[PDB]
Amino acid sequence: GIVEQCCTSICSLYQLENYCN
Amino acid sequence: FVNQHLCGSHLVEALYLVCGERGFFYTPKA
Ligand SMILES: [Cl-]
Ligand SMILES: [Cl-]
Numbered sequence: 486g487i488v489e490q491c492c493t494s495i496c497s498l499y500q501l502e503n504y505c506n
Numbered sequence: 507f508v509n510q511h512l513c514g515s516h517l518v519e520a521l522y523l524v525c526g527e528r529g530f531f532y533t534p535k536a
């Protein structure tokens with residue numbers, strides 16, 4: 486999930502918008 | 507090991523800024 490995708494490598498703002506409602 | 511609890515604290519503050527008024531659901535379990 487988000488923890489797997491964004492704690493070992495950085496997630497940009499465009500990647501993190503994937504998790505918004 | 508990667509400390510998922512400390513990373514999660516930061517990821518929820520980043521989601522707060524990126525999602526704004528849309529909001530978000532945060533579920534640790536994968
Ligand atoms: Cl930290
Ligand atoms: Cl982040």
Ligand SMILES: [Cl-]
Pocket residue numbers: 520
């Ligand atoms: Cl950040």
Ligand SMILES: [Zn+2]
Pocket residue numbers: 512516
């Ligand atoms: Zn920290």
Ligand SMILES: [Zn+2]
Pocket residue numbers: 516520
């Ligand atoms: Zn960050």
